[PDB]
């Protein structure tokens, strides 16, 4: 019934939690608050795999 998917590090069963992140190479445009001089910001987290 043991399903695996974990590592044995120093005899201890360690599991790697799925780390959530913002997707790369996508254009996202965000409105900004009144105090900021910039009103809209269009950003891409450009990354080559």
């Amino acid at each position: 019934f043991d399903m695996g998917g974990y590592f044995i590090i120093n005899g201890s069963e360690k599991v790697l939690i799925a780390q959530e992140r913002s997707a790369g190479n996508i254009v996202q445009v965000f409105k900004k608050a009144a105090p900021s001089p910039i009103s809209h910001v269009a950003e891409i987290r450009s990354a080559l795999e």
Partner: protein, 32 residues
């Protein structure tokens, strides 16, 4: 049943799920 092309019922959808869990499992994402 007799008609191979007959529409499936809601119960039959639990067969497909079973098939899925027969090939993937529960920790298929980690292993893959």
């Amino acid at each position: 049943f007799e008609d191979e092309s007959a529409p499936i019922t809601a119960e039959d959808s639990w067969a497909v799920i079973s098939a899925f869990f027969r090939e993937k499992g529960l920790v298929s994402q980690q292993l893959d």
